[PDB]
Amino acid sequence: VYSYTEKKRIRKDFGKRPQVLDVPYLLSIQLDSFQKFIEQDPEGQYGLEAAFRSVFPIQSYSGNSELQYVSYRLGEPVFDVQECQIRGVTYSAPLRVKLRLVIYEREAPEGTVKDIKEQEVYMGEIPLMTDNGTFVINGTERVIVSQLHRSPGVFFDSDKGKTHSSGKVLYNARIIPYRGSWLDFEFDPKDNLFVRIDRRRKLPATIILRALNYTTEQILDLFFEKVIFEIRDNKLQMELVPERLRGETASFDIEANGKVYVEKGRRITARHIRQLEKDDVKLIEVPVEYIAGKVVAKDYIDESTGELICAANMELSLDLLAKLSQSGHKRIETLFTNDLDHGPYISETLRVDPTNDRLSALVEIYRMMRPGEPPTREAAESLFENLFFSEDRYDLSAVGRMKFNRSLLREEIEGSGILSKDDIIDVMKKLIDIRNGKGEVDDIDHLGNRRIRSVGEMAENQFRVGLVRVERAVKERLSLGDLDTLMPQDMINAKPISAAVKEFFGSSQLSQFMDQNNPLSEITHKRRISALGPGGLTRERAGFEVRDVHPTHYGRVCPIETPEGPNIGLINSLSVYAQTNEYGFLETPYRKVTDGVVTDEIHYLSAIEEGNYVIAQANSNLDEEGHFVEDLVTCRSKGESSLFSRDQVDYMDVSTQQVVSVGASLIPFLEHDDANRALMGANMQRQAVPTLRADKPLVGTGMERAVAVDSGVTAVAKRGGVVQYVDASRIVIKVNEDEMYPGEAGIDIYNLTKYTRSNQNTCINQMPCVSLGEPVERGDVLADGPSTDLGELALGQNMRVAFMPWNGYNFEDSILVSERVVQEDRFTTIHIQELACVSRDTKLGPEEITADIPNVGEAALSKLDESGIVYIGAEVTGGDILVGKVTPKGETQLTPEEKLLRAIFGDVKDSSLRVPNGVSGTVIDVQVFTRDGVEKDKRALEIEEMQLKQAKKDLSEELQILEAGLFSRIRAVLVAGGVEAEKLDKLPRDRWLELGLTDEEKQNQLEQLAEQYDELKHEFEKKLEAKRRKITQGDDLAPGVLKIVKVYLAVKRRIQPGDKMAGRHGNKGVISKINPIEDMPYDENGTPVDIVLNPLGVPSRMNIGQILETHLGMAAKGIGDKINAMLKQQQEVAKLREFIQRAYDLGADVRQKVDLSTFSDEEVMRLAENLRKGMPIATPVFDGAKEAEIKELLKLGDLPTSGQIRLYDGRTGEQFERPVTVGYMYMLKLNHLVDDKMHARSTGSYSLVTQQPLGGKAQFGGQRFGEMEVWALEAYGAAYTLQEMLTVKSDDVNGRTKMYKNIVDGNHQMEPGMPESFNVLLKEIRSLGINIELEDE
Amino acid sequence: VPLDGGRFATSDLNDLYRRVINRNNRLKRLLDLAAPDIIVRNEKRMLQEAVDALLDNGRRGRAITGSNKRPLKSLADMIKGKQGRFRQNLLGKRVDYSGRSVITVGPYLRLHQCGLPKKMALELFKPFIYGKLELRGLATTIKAAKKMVEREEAVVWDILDEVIREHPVLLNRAPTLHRLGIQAFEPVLIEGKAIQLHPLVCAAYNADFDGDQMAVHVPLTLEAQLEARALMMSTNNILSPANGEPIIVPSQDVVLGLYYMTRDCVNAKGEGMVLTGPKEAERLYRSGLASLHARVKVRITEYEKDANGELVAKTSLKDTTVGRAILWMIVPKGLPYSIVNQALGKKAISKMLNTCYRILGLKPTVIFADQIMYTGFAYAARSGASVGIDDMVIPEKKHEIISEAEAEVAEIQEQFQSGLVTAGERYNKVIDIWAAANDRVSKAMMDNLQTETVINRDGQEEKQVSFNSIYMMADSGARGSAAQIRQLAGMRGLMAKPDGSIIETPITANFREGLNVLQYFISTHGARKGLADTALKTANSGYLTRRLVDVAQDLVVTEDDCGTHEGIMMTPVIEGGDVKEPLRDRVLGRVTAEDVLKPGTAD
RNA sequence: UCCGCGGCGCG
DNA sequence: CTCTGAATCTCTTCCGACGCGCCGCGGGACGTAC
DNA sequence: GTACGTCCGATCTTCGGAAGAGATTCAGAG
Ligand SMILES: [Mg+2]
């Protein structure tokens, strides 16, 4: 059930719960995002075609002309990835599109156009996709990060208590379109509905409503109900409706049909409600005093007078009632105006409204959005039509439309990209309802309220911006069209679109220079979710809630992986099994559960769907038929952990690993340590550094193989076979017969990437990890890379760890280290630095690049050749001269008479490059790029010839193997049809053409194949010429430079005290003092430990799993050295087979179930000798082995059950009273070395703006005193001390020179002088119109 | 300044000046030909916004930018903010003759001396070395001295040893908050590329050894060196200026060693005899014939200064353990013996050393601390105590307590399902019963872990204090807490939701046993909240500290006695229950306003 | 490059 | 009715740690001669 | 394709938190 290479070294695995689904492809987000933007999808959606149809149809101002679009196409890259990164040129592809220009005829706009012209037109240049999903721009790989932002739609916010200081909380409506102006509605402390456009001044709500040509009566009809009063035999009465009487105290005795139903002056009751609903009381007469507190709704006019008796929104009085009664108006309609249900907020706002006309409202909004301009009705209409109904300026995405429909409880989740009148109406109704208290606002912290962006999204946005600008220019030109007297190339400029795409790829907020030093570093850097960037919140403005983890975050975004610092909770990473939605949301898989059986079907659940359902936890035990043996099982309804019945759930968790991200998933025994220590440990593993020789980690998690295969650093086979030839730099594979295609058989060639520079000045190197002649299967490892070992990723090393206080050298976090570990240099790491050397084109002649320099020593030029460049492989010291360079200066001013005077008494100036001091090493490679048109030195000629023979070797070997295959097939064909088994091979293969054959297909195919042989030689030679021309040609560079020289210096950084060591639990530490091999504590056997930790950290920090990994290390090492001792004596393989079978069968029920009866004895012994360095163990995240399993592993070996072992002292050699816990633990080295931050300076350069020392390491500088340091020093009584701090060593140039002369004279005296920074401030304030002075002494 | 090539790097001031002079030339040539009034008014206005923008960009109306979208710099931009000349170049500045490296311990040093690398010593004292070698006449000019120090022969390391002999230097840490954050020592040369420091000073610095950076500077003139040697020595800085608490408290390791020292079992090897002097005690300890913590009748002869400063020697026989006598060897004359006849808690030893300083003096105090620390590490290394997996004695009653609590909450849920209680009331009572069960299981686990050790005592059997390693590491007070060990062994209890409410479901497991997804997931809330608070609080703390310090820079003592007769009546604080602060601790070390009389009125 | 901006990381 | 008029409501500005360590970009466009 | 003369527009938006200035106003005495 396992492949060939897996059987070479199989890792023992724990775990009881069976898996149901494999780990998906990790690097999937970027690939899925970008395999939508360049692909030419049918009918157009989420791609280039959408923006095309959005912007490409353009017409002039009735000039009978229109530009449109047909199709686009992308070309092949000019260079491959390797050449692009070597030279520093972008790895991009051409963008080719065909467009159509038409010109309509006069007196017939609808008629057929006058003429059409068609051409292919080119503009823009976008980069391609690496298989590793990175972008190379200037020879440096870059990675774009997905951005998290608020989902477009409607919103509701509350603002509890902060405003108005009275508890009267307001409510507001936020409208966030995908591309358009925002729209805001808000309340007031006086409960006034108001609006704000683009965060401008505050304006009433009904202004827009009447701007939509709506009468006030229609608005009142929409937003209010009717109360009807009818004139009858004695004045006024009202039609009674039961629901209009809830929670009200009667103003009079409510009696109808001559019977009392509700008594006078008393509150309505539910019994009285039942009486009202049962007695069918349609009408009742009410005294007018109860009516005298109401407001009329509509406008009533007397038709005889033609006048307005009472206006709308007017409170009614008895005189008005008498007037309308005597006018003959028997129908009276009013508003309900409930105290709790329907408050007259709209009526009050209409009362406050100063404008009551569509024209007046338009003028008001027009003058508010732009003061100081004359108003016009047509101008106001043109402005308003471009506010929320113009597709060009306002656009809401389809997902925003779906969210809008969902929030308003609509039925169609689809609609237009613009809003509508009914949208505003029912939004206002929703705000009213929320104001009434019915319904709830929508939180912003919920996951369904945010959307994740992708590289295609921002690429399309920047592309759209560039295209709208260039189409504005194109339309401007098209308004001045001609009679086909111009070319379809001239009006279009590729410069703006190219500039827009390169600024986005280069220096965007999300286009950061990516970090890469470890495979896990890239796999966790690419899978990053950021809340920053454009459209995101700033670092300072972030509160606690945005950084806080939501209950809905489970299974989608990892809460256990985030960087620590000023930005916590915003750079979170997604979960492992999380995937994206079609709309652009997050989903997590689940297992379908029937009534009693958990079906292995996998469903995908949205971010909202889990609320209506209930999910069972992964660790829930069950039978073999899907039936839970317990009936009360812990589950969650809406993030409430609780226990429900046996049959109430719909889905259950796929596995226990769908909670944390990949970074935290590599930490074994995570459940036994604190979360914070897990965070710092994940950060430390994120900052790992590769070493020269790696060793496998004893404790595995299971996904190390997945991590290795998901990383593109390893040349994984695309086709299986048997390796034909093996070399340290090149690997060639013989393709299997089934996998090879019929035509052009071929065999693949894998070229390893040798020593090259990384982004952290480390080395990226790949080495072979396979033997010769073995079979290989598809999708398998062939050559390991950095920190990779035989298909798995090995970061640190296994050290014999011990936990005890030793003489205080482990005071709090310090650690003592033997020299035994550095005797093999297993922790030594390599470092490489790139040095820049430019031959610029300057005035007064270009600079020259040879070593012919005066005032230098003979040994200085001895290392450099006649070309002035040091030989490859020469050791260099710090501060020495790298290459020779001289720069002309000119300014001769030759004096014909005074020339002899210049020789009686009393040019090109050297600018030789020097290595920075303090760093030494041996030169490895020097690369020079020469722009065309300049003569190349001989050194560049042999460099080009190096590349030439490399290309010739590769081309010749592939041509030779193709020729071998072609001649083999020619011989095979010639065997039949003119049989010559022995006559064919008597003669050399150079003559296989003119053999005498009769008229069949064989002979004619022989001439055809000879012609094909010649033809293949021809195109092979053409390819060789093209490649050699590309190599030998000059390269484009910056303006005003002739050539540039790159220097690669390698240094081997050894270990030394002051370095930062750490484990896999956040247990930090710095090595304090190396101690001799003899003085460590040692046991009876005689093998002493090499590293000693501080046991006192365990009680403080809530991490205790280190003891568990220690005991697992003891068990693994016991198995390993038992195997090594067994194999050391020449022994027969059956005993080893039995012992390994016993070891692998040890434990409870697991999914391994492996046996050695299906393995060849050679493979068995190969695995056995491969396992002599320890027994690798795999554990799950939360289903890991418990203490009892450790007990059986211990009793399998000879180690004590408790694990603790008595030790002999190393200082003086005596037994300690107590046993001590010892073992093996996988310790990690990180990149922060000791001699890269340490620096000092006595005297150096000074700044020009002020005579003060510089800083940093690129410039020889020193540290800076702060104002807080000034406070600290002035707290003490040292008065002189600060005076010389601020006087002697800082400012006074005369003073510092004089004291330097005093010091070299042996006297240490202080003389103040005057600071010049004060003079600088004096000059600054003197530049202003304010006079500064200094008074009398 | 000309950048790479023939290009030049310009400032915004140059562009602003050229713009305003161009506009001025426009004004000058404009009035030459009598331009129309509208045009001259508009051009004069443009000049006005030009000069205003030169003064301040975007202070009125819209700002203007250069090629980059960043706004142009202003004249006031060299004053306002951090980028202003004040806080960037006037109040603080970069200083020559400085060094920065990574710290380590090297505990074999004294409190007044610290290590320093060879190369850093060579680099920092270059002019002093030049002057000394010229005085000794090994060179003629500076160039010869430069060549010789570039060769670093053996003839210069001795000179460097000479110049360092009595020269003191100062050490600084970046995030200092108190005046003790900077101290001055006599450096001692040591090989390597790191700096070794005494274990006491980092505790005052609140600096661990996780890779923190350290700053060092050198006093130049004689006055600077002697004023450095005068005030900010470790000996002269032992008590915090804020409160009378000494800063010389031992933190973690030596206190653990001393706590392990003064813990005597009921019976061990070499028990029940008599012994004369602590020399014989350490002789027996090194011989291995007796336990280091075996109780033995011995005699001592201590000194007491009960007279007028006169120390009187008294001798007698006492009952104690061997280790207490061993530590009595290191005690100076004046201490009474009863101070070291107990468990020697961290607070106890802190009070002991405080009394030693307040009675005997300063030099005995600092030397006593030094050799106490030395012996503490020695006997800690001799001990070699370690943590173990079995150190967490799991109580057997945990499962039955959990079952009882589950039955009780099931009963509460059944009562709720009957429509007899509200959700809030049942929520509160479930919280109460969970808290009660947590307290009961906490008492059970501490009772199990406190005294489970059983020994035959050369009799029938007995029970004594527990020798669980975690119990010594907790009870000593070095690190940990009762809550920490409670979480380590027993269930960790209840925690609150991010909204401020508390979830009803308890975490019924400890870290030793496994944890489900839900408990870790919910505890993530509290962990994230704590880390967010710790990260966010620093900026506010810095801002408030700067605001406080910037106002009181002027108040300095100038006179001896103002001679006023106005004082305050101040009383010990009582909120209503127990007294919070006694008056004695509040009025200590102050001058009485008036002649306070005893309540013997007219006395 | 002599400085500004941005990014990441460390305490 | 009127005139303050103090009281409240609304609009505008400045301020948000402290050292660093490393890396990457840096006036530029854009027309006018030539 | 390179040196030089010459100047620089429709446009985003989401922070407490307070301090302070100014605008407005509706409340009451004359
Ligand atoms: Mg630190």
PDB file of N, CA, C and O in Angstrom, chain A residues 591-625:
ATOM      1  N   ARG A 591     -18.686  16.190   7.252  1.00  0.00           N
ATOM      2  CA  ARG A 591     -19.128  14.838   6.938  1.00  0.00           C
ATOM      3  C   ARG A 591     -20.636  14.739   7.117  1.00  0.00           C
ATOM      4  O   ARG A 591     -21.161  15.074   8.182  1.00  0.00           O
ATOM      5  N   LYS A 592     -21.324  14.276   6.076  1.00  0.00           N
ATOM      6  CA  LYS A 592     -22.770  14.121   6.143  1.00  0.00           C
ATOM      7  C   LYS A 592     -23.140  13.026   7.137  1.00  0.00           C
ATOM      8  O   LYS A 592     -22.558  11.938   7.125  1.00  0.00           O
ATOM      9  N   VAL A 593     -24.108  13.316   8.001  1.00  0.00           N
ATOM     10  CA  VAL A 593     -24.554  12.388   9.032  1.00  0.00           C
ATOM     11  C   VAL A 593     -26.022  12.071   8.796  1.00  0.00           C
ATOM     12  O   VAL A 593     -26.855  12.983   8.715  1.00  0.00           O
ATOM     13  N   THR A 594     -26.336  10.785   8.685  1.00  0.00           N
ATOM     14  CA  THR A 594     -27.716  10.330   8.596  1.00  0.00           C
ATOM     15  C   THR A 594     -28.310  10.264  10.001  1.00  0.00           C
ATOM     16  O   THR A 594     -27.777  10.835  10.957  1.00  0.00           O
ATOM     17  N   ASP A 595     -29.448   9.578  10.134  1.00  0.00           N
ATOM     18  CA  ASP A 595     -30.080   9.435  11.441  1.00  0.00           C
ATOM     19  C   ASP A 595     -29.171   8.704  12.422  1.00  0.00           C
ATOM     20  O   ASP A 595     -29.062   9.099  13.589  1.00  0.00           O
ATOM     21  N   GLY A 596     -28.507   7.642  11.972  1.00  0.00           N
ATOM     22  CA  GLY A 596     -27.649   6.877  12.855  1.00  0.00           C
ATOM     23  C   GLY A 596     -26.242   6.655  12.339  1.00  0.00           C
ATOM     24  O   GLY A 596     -25.341   6.326  13.114  1.00  0.00           O
ATOM     25  N   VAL A 597     -26.035   6.835  11.037  1.00  0.00           N
ATOM     26  CA  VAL A 597     -24.765   6.526  10.392  1.00  0.00           C
ATOM     27  C   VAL A 597     -24.167   7.810   9.837  1.00  0.00           C
ATOM     28  O   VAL A 597     -24.873   8.631   9.244  1.00  0.00           O
ATOM     29  N   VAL A 598     -22.862   7.984  10.040  1.00  0.00           N
ATOM     30  CA  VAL A 598     -22.131   9.123   9.497  1.00  0.00           C
ATOM     31  C   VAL A 598     -21.622   8.710   8.120  1.00  0.00           C
ATOM     32  O   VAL A 598     -20.628   7.992   7.998  1.00  0.00           O
ATOM     33  N   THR A 599     -22.315   9.160   7.078  1.00  0.00           N
ATOM     34  CA  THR A 599     -21.906   8.856   5.714  1.00  0.00           C
ATOM     35  C   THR A 599     -20.613   9.588   5.374  1.00  0.00           C
ATOM     36  O   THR A 599     -20.424  10.750   5.740  1.00  0.00           O
ATOM     37  N   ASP A 600     -19.717   8.898   4.668  1.00  0.00           N
ATOM     38  CA  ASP A 600     -18.425   9.456   4.277  1.00  0.00           C
ATOM     39  C   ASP A 600     -18.527  10.531   3.195  1.00  0.00           C
ATOM     40  O   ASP A 600     -17.478  10.953   2.700  1.00  0.00           O
ATOM     41  N   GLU A 601     -19.723  10.963   2.807  1.00  0.00           N
ATOM     42  CA  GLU A 601     -19.871  12.077   1.882  1.00  0.00           C
ATOM     43  C   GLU A 601     -19.361  13.366   2.518  1.00  0.00           C
ATOM     44  O   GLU A 601     -19.475  13.577   3.729  1.00  0.00           O
ATOM     45  N   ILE A 602     -18.796  14.239   1.687  1.00  0.00           N
ATOM     46  CA  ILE A 602     -18.261  15.519   2.132  1.00  0.00           C
ATOM     47  C   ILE A 602     -19.097  16.632   1.519  1.00  0.00           C
ATOM     48  O   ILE A 602     -19.216  16.721   0.291  1.00  0.00           O
ATOM     49  N   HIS A 603     -19.660  17.481   2.370  1.00  0.00           N
ATOM     50  CA  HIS A 603     -20.361  18.680   1.940  1.00  0.00           C
ATOM     51  C   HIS A 603     -19.539  19.913   2.286  1.00  0.00           C
ATOM     52  O   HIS A 603     -18.673  19.889   3.164  1.00  0.00           O
ATOM     53  N   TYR A 604     -19.825  21.000   1.577  1.00  0.00           N
ATOM     54  CA  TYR A 604     -19.176  22.282   1.800  1.00  0.00           C
ATOM     55  C   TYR A 604     -20.201  23.262   2.352  1.00  0.00           C
ATOM     56  O   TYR A 604     -21.273  23.442   1.764  1.00  0.00           O
ATOM     57  N   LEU A 605     -19.869  23.893   3.473  1.00  0.00           N
ATOM     58  CA  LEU A 605     -20.804  24.731   4.212  1.00  0.00           C
ATOM     59  C   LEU A 605     -20.346  26.181   4.165  1.00  0.00           C
ATOM     60  O   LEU A 605     -19.157  26.468   4.330  1.00  0.00           O
ATOM     61  N   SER A 606     -21.296  27.087   3.949  1.00  0.00           N
ATOM     62  CA  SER A 606     -21.002  28.510   3.855  1.00  0.00           C
ATOM     63  C   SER A 606     -20.749  29.082   5.250  1.00  0.00           C
ATOM     64  O   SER A 606     -20.744  28.366   6.256  1.00  0.00           O
ATOM     65  N   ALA A 607     -20.537  30.397   5.320  1.00  0.00           N
ATOM     66  CA  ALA A 607     -20.190  31.031   6.588  1.00  0.00           C
ATOM     67  C   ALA A 607     -21.417  31.302   7.450  1.00  0.00           C
ATOM     68  O   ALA A 607     -21.277  31.743   8.596  1.00  0.00           O
ATOM     69  N   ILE A 608     -22.617  31.079   6.918  1.00  0.00           N
ATOM     70  CA  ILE A 608     -23.841  31.385   7.652  1.00  0.00           C
ATOM     71  C   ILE A 608     -24.592  30.097   7.970  1.00  0.00           C
ATOM     72  O   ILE A 608     -25.326  30.022   8.962  1.00  0.00           O
ATOM     73  N   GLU A 609     -24.394  29.070   7.140  1.00  0.00           N
ATOM     74  CA  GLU A 609     -25.218  27.866   7.213  1.00  0.00           C
ATOM     75  C   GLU A 609     -25.044  27.094   8.514  1.00  0.00           C
ATOM     76  O   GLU A 609     -25.937  26.321   8.882  1.00  0.00           O
ATOM     77  N   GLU A 610     -23.926  27.274   9.220  1.00  0.00           N
ATOM     78  CA  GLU A 610     -23.698  26.491  10.431  1.00  0.00           C
ATOM     79  C   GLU A 610     -24.612  26.928  11.569  1.00  0.00           C
ATOM     80  O   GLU A 610     -24.832  26.158  12.511  1.00  0.00           O
ATOM     81  N   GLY A 611     -25.139  28.152  11.507  1.00  0.00           N
ATOM     82  CA  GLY A 611     -26.005  28.628  12.574  1.00  0.00           C
ATOM     83  C   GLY A 611     -27.289  27.830  12.690  1.00  0.00           C
ATOM     84  O   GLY A 611     -27.737  27.513  13.793  1.00  0.00           O
ATOM     85  N   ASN A 612     -27.887  27.478  11.556  1.00  0.00           N
ATOM     86  CA  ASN A 612     -29.137  26.732  11.572  1.00  0.00           C
ATOM     87  C   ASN A 612     -28.947  25.259  11.906  1.00  0.00           C
ATOM     88  O   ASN A 612     -29.942  24.559  12.122  1.00  0.00           O
ATOM     89  N   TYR A 613     -27.713  24.774  11.951  1.00  0.00           N
ATOM     90  CA  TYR A 613     -27.421  23.369  12.195  1.00  0.00           C
ATOM     91  C   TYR A 613     -26.594  23.222  13.469  1.00  0.00           C
ATOM     92  O   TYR A 613     -26.323  24.191  14.183  1.00  0.00           O
ATOM     93  N   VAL A 614     -26.195  21.984  13.745  1.00  0.00           N
ATOM     94  CA  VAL A 614     -25.376  21.649  14.905  1.00  0.00           C
ATOM     95  C   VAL A 614     -24.337  20.619  14.475  1.00  0.00           C
ATOM     96  O   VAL A 614     -24.640  19.699  13.707  1.00  0.00           O
ATOM     97  N   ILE A 615     -23.104  20.792  14.946  1.00  0.00           N
ATOM     98  CA  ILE A 615     -21.962  20.014  14.483  1.00  0.00           C
ATOM     99  C   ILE A 615     -21.345  19.277  15.664  1.00  0.00           C
ATOM    100  O   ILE A 615     -21.183  19.846  16.748  1.00  0.00           O
ATOM    101  N   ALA A 616     -21.002  18.009  15.446  1.00  0.00           N
ATOM    102  CA  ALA A 616     -20.348  17.193  16.459  1.00  0.00           C
ATOM    103  C   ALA A 616     -18.834  17.331  16.359  1.00  0.00           C
ATOM    104  O   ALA A 616     -18.287  17.547  15.274  1.00  0.00           O
ATOM    105  N   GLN A 617     -18.163  17.202  17.501  1.00  0.00           N
ATOM    106  CA  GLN A 617     -16.715  17.351  17.549  1.00  0.00           C
ATOM    107  C   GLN A 617     -16.026  16.132  16.940  1.00  0.00           C
ATOM    108  O   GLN A 617     -16.586  15.034  16.886  1.00  0.00           O
ATOM    109  N   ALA A 618     -14.794  16.346  16.468  1.00  0.00           N
ATOM    110  CA  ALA A 618     -14.053  15.284  15.791  1.00  0.00           C
ATOM    111  C   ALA A 618     -13.724  14.134  16.734  1.00  0.00           C
ATOM    112  O   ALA A 618     -13.812  12.962  16.350  1.00  0.00           O
ATOM    113  N   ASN A 619     -13.341  14.445  17.973  1.00  0.00           N
ATOM    114  CA  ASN A 619     -12.900  13.417  18.911  1.00  0.00           C
ATOM    115  C   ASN A 619     -14.045  12.591  19.487  1.00  0.00           C
ATOM    116  O   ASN A 619     -13.806  11.812  20.416  1.00  0.00           O
ATOM    117  N   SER A 620     -15.267  12.741  18.978  1.00  0.00           N
ATOM    118  CA  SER A 620     -16.399  11.966  19.466  1.00  0.00           C
ATOM    119  C   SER A 620     -16.247  10.496  19.098  1.00  0.00           C
ATOM    120  O   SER A 620     -16.244  10.143  17.914  1.00  0.00           O
ATOM    121  N   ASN A 621     -16.118   9.636  20.104  1.00  0.00           N
ATOM    122  CA  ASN A 621     -15.981   8.210  19.859  1.00  0.00           C
ATOM    123  C   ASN A 621     -17.289   7.628  19.333  1.00  0.00           C
ATOM    124  O   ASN A 621     -18.378   8.155  19.571  1.00  0.00           O
ATOM    125  N   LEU A 622     -17.168   6.520  18.607  1.00  0.00           N
ATOM    126  CA  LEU A 622     -18.312   5.928  17.928  1.00  0.00           C
ATOM    127  C   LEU A 622     -18.015   4.462  17.651  1.00  0.00           C
ATOM    128  O   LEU A 622     -16.911   3.971  17.898  1.00  0.00           O
ATOM    129  N   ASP A 623     -19.025   3.768  17.132  1.00  0.00           N
ATOM    130  CA  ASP A 623     -18.895   2.363  16.773  1.00  0.00           C
ATOM    131  C   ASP A 623     -18.246   2.243  15.395  1.00  0.00           C
ATOM    132  O   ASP A 623     -17.706   3.208  14.846  1.00  0.00           O
ATOM    133  N   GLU A 624     -18.295   1.048  14.815  1.00  0.00           N
ATOM    134  CA  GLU A 624     -17.819   0.830  13.458  1.00  0.00           C
ATOM    135  C   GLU A 624     -18.912   1.011  12.414  1.00  0.00           C
ATOM    136  O   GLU A 624     -18.651   0.813  11.223  1.00  0.00           O
ATOM    137  N   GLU A 625     -20.126   1.380  12.829  1.00  0.00           N
ATOM    138  CA  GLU A 625     -21.240   1.588  11.912  1.00  0.00           C
ATOM    139  C   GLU A 625     -21.744   3.027  11.937  1.00  0.00           C
ATOM    140  O   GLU A 625     -22.862   3.296  11.490  1.00  0.00           O
TER     141      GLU A 625
END
